[PDB]
Design an enzyme around this catalytic site. Structure first.
Site, PDB file in Angstrom:
ATOM      1  N   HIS A   6     -41.213  34.066 -18.036  1.00 61.45           N
ATOM      2  CA  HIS A   6     -40.077  34.703 -17.784  1.00 61.45           C
ATOM      3  C   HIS A   6     -38.973  34.145 -17.254  1.00 61.45           C
ATOM      4  O   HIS A   6     -37.799  34.211 -17.454  1.00 61.45           O
ATOM      5  CB  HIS A   6     -40.307  36.115 -17.445  1.00 61.45           C
ATOM      6  CG  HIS A   6     -40.623  36.150 -16.245  1.00 61.45           C
ATOM      7  ND1 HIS A   6     -41.959  36.064 -15.474  1.00 61.45           N
ATOM      8  CD2 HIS A   6     -39.843  36.466 -14.868  1.00 61.45           C
ATOM      9  CE1 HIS A   6     -41.778  36.137 -14.044  1.00 61.45           C
ATOM     10  NE2 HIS A   6     -40.356  36.127 -13.804  1.00 61.45           N
ATOM     11  N   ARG A   7     -38.988  33.579 -16.147  1.00 64.41           N
ATOM     12  CA  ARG A   7     -38.124  32.745 -15.549  1.00 64.41           C
ATOM     13  C   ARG A   7     -38.121  31.384 -15.763  1.00 64.41           C
ATOM     14  O   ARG A   7     -39.423  30.706 -15.929  1.00 64.41           O
ATOM     15  CB  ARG A   7     -38.181  32.938 -13.883  1.00 64.41           C
ATOM     16  CG  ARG A   7     -36.950  33.603 -13.482  1.00 64.41           C
ATOM     17  CD  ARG A   7     -36.563  34.615 -14.014  1.00 64.41           C
ATOM     18  NE  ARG A   7     -35.546  35.407 -13.312  1.00 64.41           N
ATOM     19  CZ  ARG A   7     -34.451  36.370 -13.983  1.00 64.41           C
ATOM     20  NH1 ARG A   7     -34.730  36.760 -15.204  1.00 64.41           N
ATOM     21  NH2 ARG A   7     -33.877  36.928 -12.957  1.00 64.41           N
ATOM     22  N   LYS A  47     -49.490  27.537 -10.129  1.00 58.12           N
ATOM     23  CA  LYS A  47     -50.603  27.031  -9.133  1.00 58.12           C
ATOM     24  C   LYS A  47     -51.258  25.930  -9.628  1.00 58.12           C
ATOM     25  O   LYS A  47     -51.698  25.861 -10.886  1.00 58.12           O
ATOM     26  CB  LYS A  47     -51.369  28.256  -8.797  1.00 58.12           C
ATOM     27  CG  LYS A  47     -52.107  28.098  -7.428  1.00 58.12           C
ATOM     28  CD  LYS A  47     -51.107  28.136  -6.274  1.00 58.12           C
ATOM     29  CE  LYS A  47     -51.448  27.999  -5.042  1.00 58.12           C
ATOM     30  NZ  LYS A  47     -50.555  28.009  -4.011  1.00 58.12           N
ATOM     31  N   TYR A  67     -44.529  32.169  16.539  1.00 63.08           N
ATOM     32  CA  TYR A  67     -43.499  32.886  16.784  1.00 63.08           C
ATOM     33  C   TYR A  67     -43.923  34.290  16.967  1.00 63.08           C
ATOM     34  O   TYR A  67     -42.819  35.249  17.323  1.00 63.08           O
ATOM     35  CB  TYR A  67     -42.785  32.942  15.526  1.00 63.08           C
ATOM     36  CG  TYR A  67     -41.671  31.683  15.440  1.00 63.08           C
ATOM     37  CD1 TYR A  67     -40.779  31.458  16.074  1.00 63.08           C
ATOM     38  CD2 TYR A  67     -42.113  30.653  14.383  1.00 63.08           C
ATOM     39  CE1 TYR A  67     -39.865  30.408  16.038  1.00 63.08           C
ATOM     40  CE2 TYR A  67     -41.110  29.500  14.175  1.00 63.08           C
ATOM     41  CZ  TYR A  67     -40.185  29.213  14.930  1.00 63.08           C
ATOM     42  OH  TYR A  67     -39.379  28.369  15.024  1.00 63.08           O
TER      43      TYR A  67
HETATM   44  O1  LIG Z   1     -30.414  37.216 -10.460  1.00 63.54           O
HETATM   45  C1  LIG Z   1     -30.659  38.464 -10.176  1.00 63.54           C
HETATM   46  O2  LIG Z   1     -31.437  39.245 -11.259  1.00 63.54           O
HETATM   47  C2  LIG Z   1     -32.619  39.978 -10.532  1.00 63.54           C
HETATM   48  C3  LIG Z   1     -32.173  41.318 -10.287  1.00 63.54           C
HETATM   49  C4  LIG Z   1     -33.039  42.553 -10.077  1.00 63.54           C
HETATM   50  C5  LIG Z   1     -32.932  43.575  -9.307  1.00 63.54           C
HETATM   51  O3  LIG Z   1     -32.261  43.639  -8.362  1.00 63.54           O
HETATM   52  C6  LIG Z   1     -33.834  44.545  -9.235  1.00 63.54           C
HETATM   53  C7  LIG Z   1     -34.815  44.466 -10.355  1.00 63.54           C
HETATM   54  O4  LIG Z   1     -35.632  45.835  -9.969  1.00 63.54           O
HETATM   55  C8  LIG Z   1     -34.787  43.560 -11.220  1.00 63.54           C
HETATM   56  C9  LIG Z   1     -34.106  42.392 -11.240  1.00 63.54           C
HETATM   57  O5  LIG Z   1     -34.060  41.481 -12.185  1.00 63.54           O
HETATM   58  C10 LIG Z   1     -33.569  40.052 -11.691  1.00 63.54           C
HETATM   59  C11 LIG Z   1     -34.907  39.324 -11.424  1.00 63.54           C
HETATM   60  C12 LIG Z   1     -35.026  38.725 -10.154  1.00 63.54           C
HETATM   61  C13 LIG Z   1     -36.148  38.209  -9.633  1.00 63.54           C
HETATM   62  C14 LIG Z   1     -37.137  38.040 -10.531  1.00 63.54           C
HETATM   63  O6  LIG Z   1     -38.411  37.177 -10.268  1.00 63.54           O
HETATM   64  C15 LIG Z   1     -37.115  38.846 -11.731  1.00 63.54           C
HETATM   65  O7  LIG Z   1     -38.500  38.779 -12.599  1.00 63.54           O
HETATM   66  C16 LIG Z   1     -36.048  39.366 -12.192  1.00 63.54           C
HETATM   67  C17 LIG Z   1     -30.529  39.080  -8.653  1.00 63.54           C
HETATM   68  C18 LIG Z   1     -31.249  38.540  -7.642  1.00 63.54           C
HETATM   69  C19 LIG Z   1     -30.901  39.025  -6.396  1.00 63.54           C
HETATM   70  O8  LIG Z   1     -31.605  38.786  -5.272  1.00 63.54           O
HETATM   71  C20 LIG Z   1     -29.992  40.091  -6.128  1.00 63.54           C
HETATM   72  O9  LIG Z   1     -29.654  40.840  -5.098  1.00 63.54           O
HETATM   73  C21 LIG Z   1     -29.216  40.650  -7.445  1.00 63.54           C
HETATM   74  O10 LIG Z   1     -28.300  41.766  -7.239  1.00 63.54           O
HETATM   75  C22 LIG Z   1     -29.629  39.988  -8.728  1.00 63.54           C
END
Ligand SMILES: O=C(O[C@H]1Cc2c(O)cc(O)cc2O[C@@H]1c1ccc(O)c(O)c1)c1cc(O)c(O)c(O)c1
Ligand SMILES: O=C(O[C@H]1Cc2c(O)cc(O)cc2O[C@@H]1c1ccc(O)c(O)c1)c1cc(O)c(O)c(O)c1
Ligand SMILES: O=C(O[C@H]1Cc2c(O)cc(O)cc2O[C@@H]1c1ccc(O)c(O)c1)c1cc(O)c(O)c(O)c1
EC number: 1.4.1.3
Lengths: 496, 496, 496
Positions: A80-81, A121, A257
């Site tokens: 997915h990513r 992994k 730590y």
């Molecule tokens: O690019 C971003 O998209 C993530 C935003 C997001 C969320 O905030 C909440 C949620 O419930 C789902 C979700 O989907 C995306 C996501 C991220 C990581 C994963 O592993 C994954 O499968 C899916 C991002 C990353 C940040 O750190 C932020 O602060 C920010 O505002 C946006």
């Protein structure tokens, strides 16, 4: 040590049942049936299994000249990513069903801490002691090679990391192999692996990462009595004893730590012995007990104690060694009151039901040692940016501060008609060290906290929405599943 | 009651033991120890196991809209040759250990008939009757994609083929997928798979290929009484009865072309029942019993017969269906005299010791259906040449012949003063049809015979070199082993 | 005289001035100036220098653990033909100016025999006796890598070959490395180096290549009386003697085949002594003096002779050993009638104006021993076509001939009343073994043979245009140049 295999598969299914009502209610579409159940029942059946998992086998030349075959595995859970990621391990325990589960776990770990990665992994069924350093270089360098040919290593494809008896020097070989052969023409070739030493394009602060992760994870808990009003204990973080298992990488710095802040120790165990000392052992000394001679066996203050490692009367237990050391043979025991998973899955669902019924809080590995990959994330980003963080925005910022402060001085010296008295040019003692000792690690440390702390909010909110209370594990996976779902939902079935 | 997995692992070890002498003898180097064993005993430990093997798992949506996971496998045995070769299977019987064995088998099969390919194999745990045609296309095209991603499909890397429950139309989707997505920029993109239909870049004589392979293989045996002086039975090829199992692709033309030459049939069986007729059934009729109706069930002169398919009173039995149908439950039976393995490994090592002890001739799949890949080889070569064979060297050949013939005429009418008498312009009736009906098809048949026949010579020489006599199975593998070893011995341990 | 440095620069310039007139004459464009000379005078100055040459510097580490810096060079002379060609050399002799020179040679060498290869050459400044076999693999292996990252090894870019102390096993390492790292995705990966062994994709006829090349170069002159009505001698090839030097590889086959056909021997000698016997030594016995003993010392009928090797009374002298064995110290004698350069330029421009002014014929190494790369050229194509030449058209052409021989028989058995009397079924005994022993060799030797024959017909034609009579050297380069010019002319000035 149970057979199980399906260790992680149970927790997903557990968290899966509860969001079956949320996704059908939060999805805004025009289909509106109850086949909504049938779409989602399908979507979760895709995330459950690993999408790709390569079994490998390659020969090498021992320093004898003898020839031996080496089995190796690598599982990409989800895609997915865009880039899967997960460490690689060197041990005889290595099994196919092992990494298939561990890679699965890594997917949800990255989801909890909002890390844009897919779970992955790997594992090599050897024993690192039985080979030389020259013998072990050819294993990693060619394991690298046989993985690039089949698309299981590369930036944006898959990025592995160190792990069990895998160190920085080994990742350096990984990098050096990929950047000299396949991924030559790739500009970001050195980004193929996170965990490499600092002269090799690494990052400051991941040497500590899993430790501060262990630390910051525990920190966001015994600073809120919303879980002590049920567990007991004291918000006074100081006078608490801990005990580690597996004195190595994660074991050292989860203690290095943790001690710093006034929290005493009491015990330390490795793969042959343990230590017992109610006064509190100090890593100040016993850290020169590694290769100085070889293997731990007691020292001044360090008494020779045998029985097991958990046992000992303690508060915070961290099994940062191998996997599944907690089962029914010892779950009704453990004279402890809070456990924190430094390694990957030492607690089995065989034991959670017991711990939950005894009011013992186990901090899920899905959250605790997520710092390691969160910084790994940063290390990756570093190589795509090809700059140390803050390498250009330090003098501009420290000069901006010093102008700002003096600006309030001079602004205070015209309402006060004599120009000379006031002196706010000096910042507080803490801040003066902040801009004098400003480096890359400070950005990393703050980003690690901002990622860790904000993730604990995402859990202690989704836990108090389902009355999980003490079972933060089923509160963790239930937040990661929801994050990976929308990633699949909003991407649509791909017709290829 | 079949048996487990190691199917072929025993045969290699069986043949391996007897080459251990000549390999240390024929090797010419300045090494010279008893460590000559330790190199060779090591080299063989690399060829036994498959080097790579991808376990896959990809999602699709049925015509329902329902969602179902599909497990998929693919094993590349060796990589001593630059591309790997091996068909893909669509059945619920599909197992990991299956293709792992089958891919191993394909490596030596391509070595017997001197085909510069590495062995490979794949499988899809579905059941094709339970899916529609529109549904099955999604599987193949998607399965294609997830394989090009991880480098298990492509010209010069790995080329699959059809098998059972896989036809030309599916190979056409494979190609159309690869040639429109990943390998678009590849000139030889359409070479990624052999077995495709002719309007898609195939080759004439491939539909028949496995059949003629079954035929020419059997042909090089009942044409020399050096194996009838021990088996009994007449070299007069005609009056011999045969029975086929699995009336499908390989079952058809192993009969269609075997009948042609005056050999009576007697029985034909599928997954439902069989046929029993001492007069002899004719594929000229009962060949319009496929989709015309749907499944076999007898016809005029085709009687309903049960019991089994192999015990019928026969001379030449060919289990051209699934795998392992000859085990201890039926080896001390089979009213036959010579068996020919049309499918992959139907005779177990559990049955050979019974057949050999009763003086029964089993023709190894390692050699018999090798025509299938030998023409596959040619089809591949057609796509790297981008010409139908003979597309330029036919009229030049046909014109050169006619000039050569009249050259003997005009040179014979010179010593004979009358200029009009002699007429050798006309070739023999057989040769006139040759240069008239000249096509690519013929170059394939002659090359298949040349490859097949010369392979039987490489066997019947290495058989009586070791007094194998009737056990040509162990005379087959013993020939393939030494061909792959040479490839490995002269390529050297690659430090990478 | 340019005894090492600008070795050939004299040859080009001397040849360059000659083609001036023909080129502006042969030029058919709308220019029509006196600036036509400026065009060609510049274009030749483009061909004279190697347009690219890489000097290398890479490290290794020996069996000790000590470390050594290795210098290495490779010079790509021209890129008019898409791939560049030329062997590599492992000697302390190796110099920047050396490889920069031999690369120029290989350009025009492969322009006489009409081979679409650009000229290149490489060298490594070491001494193989000082390194172990293990040590020599890593040198070869990594030397490959550093040439690929910079684009000096690869099909369609540049293809090396063996040469001085460079064996097949070493070429096998070049491929195995290139085909396993950089050129992994390349279908023609193993086509990056020629001279590799058979099992690794070699061609049959390399070993026997230069010997045949020597003979066919000889054959195209003692058969044309244009160059006997001026030198004297009988075109009658039979009763003539030859004296060789350098009894190894090129030397053996240049004699073995030269004797088989009618020529008598007289003398043989290597880096130790010489043999003298006007009765005529016979190679079918004295060849068992190789590793059966260790070095030459004479044998029965093999007289122990001193003095030298060349001055022996003889007709055909071949220097098939080292560089420069003919200067003013031996040119005024060597009472022989013809000298064929078996090695690379053993004749100096300090000795041609002695041979030319004595009516002796010195055959240029620009054409004679060019029978090694032409076969090496074929081996490239084999790796491209992935088939043994005639793998498919052997039984087809053998079946076609018998049908012809019977077609005449049946055609003659009808004007004659009885049907079976005549028997032209059996061909001549020389032809019977031809279809019986039909293999790849026979095709290579012919393709070789036609190549130099056309080449000889191209030299002797360009020479009779400029009355060179005996200077085949300048008649040789003068031909290659116009070929190279025509390529460059119709291409134009690349504006990039
Ligand atoms: O690019 C971003 O998209 C993530 C935003 C997001 C969320 O905030 C909440 C949620 O419930 C789902 C979700 O989907 C995306 C996501 C991220 C990581 C994963 O592993 C994954 O499968 C899916 C991002 C990353 C940040 O750190 C932020 O602060 C920010 O505002 C946006
Ligand atoms: O290019 C060729 O090299 C093969 C020739 C060869 C052989 O004749 C005998 C033997 O014992 C080993 C062997 O090694 C090569 C090989 C071929 C196929 C494989 O699968 C494999 O592993 C290794 C070739 C192919 C033909 O068809 C020929 O007729 C021919 O003369 C040469
Ligand atoms: O494609 C072909 O083009 C070559 C043919 C050719 C030629 O016959 C005479 C000449 O004066 C120039 C010339 O230009 C090309 C060439 C070839 C090789 C070189 O090294 C080189 O610089 C230039 C070719 C190759 C053959 O072998 C043939 O038999 C044939 O008919 C055609």
């Amino acid at each position: 040590d149970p057979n199980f295999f399906k260790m992680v598969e149970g927790f997903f299914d557990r968290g899966a049942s509860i969001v079956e009502d949320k996704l059908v209610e939060d999805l805004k579409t025009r289909e509106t049936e109850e086949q909504k159940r049938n779409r989602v029942r399908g979507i979760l059946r895709i995330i459950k299994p690993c999408n790709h998992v390569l079994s490998l086998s390659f020969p090498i030349r021992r320093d004898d000249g003898s020839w031996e075959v080496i089995e190796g595995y690598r599982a990409q859970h989800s895609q997915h990513r865009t880039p899967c990621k997960g460490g690689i391990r060197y041990s005889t325990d290595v099994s196919v069903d092992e990494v298939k589960a561990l890679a699965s776990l890594m997917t949800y770990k990255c989801a909890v801490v909002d890390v844009p990665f897919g779970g992955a992994k790997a594992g090599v069924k050897i024993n690192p002691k039985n080979y030389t350093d020259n013998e072990l270089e050819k294993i990693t360098r060619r394991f690298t090679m046989e993985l690039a040919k089949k698309g299981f290593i590369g930036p944006g494809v898959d990025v592995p990391a160190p792990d069990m008896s895998t160190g920085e020097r080994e990742m350096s070989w990984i990098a050096d192999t990929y950047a000299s052969t396949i991924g030559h023409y790739d500009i970001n070739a050195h980004a193929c692996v996170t965990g490499k030493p600092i002269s090799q394009g690494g990052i400051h602060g991941r040497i500590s990462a899993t430790g501060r992760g262990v630390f910051h994870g525990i920190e966001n808990f015994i600073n809120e009595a919303s879980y002590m009003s049920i567990l007991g204990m004291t918000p006074g973080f100081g006078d608490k004893t801990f005990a580690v298992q597996g004195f190595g990488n994660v074991g050292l710095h989860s203690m290095r730590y943790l001690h710093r802040f006034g929290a005493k120790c009491v015990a330390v165990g490795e793969s042959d012995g343990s230590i017992w000392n109610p006064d509190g052992i100090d890593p100040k000394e016993l850290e020169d007990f590694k290769l100085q001679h070889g293997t731990i066996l007691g020292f001044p203050k360090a008494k020779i104690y045998e029985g097991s490692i958990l046992e000992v009367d303690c508060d915070i237990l961290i099994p940062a060694a191998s996997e599944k050391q907690l089962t029914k043979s010892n779950a009704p025991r453990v004279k402890a009151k809070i456990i924190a998973e430094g390694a990957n899955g030492p607690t089995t669902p065989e034991a959670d039901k017991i711990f939950l019924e005894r009011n013992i809080m186990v901090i899920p590995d899905l959250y605790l040692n997520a710092g390691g990959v969160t910084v790994s994330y940063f290390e990756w980003l570093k190589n795509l940016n090809h700059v140390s963080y803050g390498r250009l925005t330090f003098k501009y910022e420290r000069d901006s501060n010093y102008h700002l402060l003096m600006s309030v001085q001079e602004s205070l010296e015209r309402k006060f008609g004599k120009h000379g008295g006031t002196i706010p040019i000096v910042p507080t003692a803490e801040f003066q060290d902040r801009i004098s000792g400003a480096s890359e690690k400070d950005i990393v440390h703050s980003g690690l906290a901002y990622t860790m702390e904000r993730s604990a909010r995402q859990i202690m909110r989704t836990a108090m929405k389902y009355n999980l209370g003490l079972d933060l594990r089923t509160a963790a996976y239930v937040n990661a599943i929801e994050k990976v779902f929308r990633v699949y939902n909003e991407a649509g079935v791909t017709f290829t």
